Design a protein around this ligand. Structure first.
Ligand SMILES: [Zn+2]
Lengths: 28, 21, 29, 21, 28, 29, 21, 21, 28, 29, 21, 21
């Protein structure tokens, strides 16, 4: 995959895409 | 963190698999 | 202010509400 | 949970406050 | 709620989330 | 160039078209 | 309106020009 | 404006309720 | 239309909106 | 990691995966 | 193609690698 | 390119019709 620079909901739009059904903990 | 590093810098789509459950 | 939210739309809709505070998605709950 | 509340059903924002660390 | 820095469609993606069915006037 | 647009997708699709000019969403019309 | 045109039905962009201040 | 202030600065999800209808 | 400054998926969210069914070649 | 992706959601989901490499959408294939 | 794989059906990411120039 | 010019500068929704198929 490529090393992508995510900020804002972009980050969460990625986290979603990866894990999806499992979940994820977003904590800045 | 990797919640920041991605924004400061870059990060993989493996680096972000960790925070999954 | 009472919509259907499913998928990204939801976890985007979290980011604004809580944001820095943090939040969590866990479909299996 | 979050989905049942908000997807199948719907919810206010005060109902999304609820899943915030 | 938190004080969020929106620019671009992000702004409108927010305006949507809030009002939704009522509407909104976007005028920059 | 003739798609179904519903929700954010729409009001995002306005932002590009009109933008600075301004636009308005008013489902109840 | 905008929805009927573009959601239930569909529309071009010249049909979105139309709701621009 | 609050169409700018949000971008220049920050704004609440109350500040944005006003422009609703 | 208006001259819009797109970067990131925004660009592709635009490319999509325009062409859609025809396709598009994204090559940076 | 096995979701339904349709529309923008898809061609956004390409951008992250491939990105600079480039990619292509061609529904008619 | 991409849709059948991922829309009607579903797919992994290794299945999206596949449409990358 | 117009994959850059848009980001560096601005671009129309005609400029982007070209890369379509
Ligand atoms: Zn969507």
């Amino acid at each position: 995959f490529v090393n992508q620079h995510l900020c804002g909901s972009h980050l969460v739009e990625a986290l979603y895409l990866v894990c999806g059904e499992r979940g994820f903990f977003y904590t800045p | 963190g990797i919640v920041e590093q991605c924004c400061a810098s870059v990060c993989s789509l493996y680096q972000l698999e960790n925070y999954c459950n």
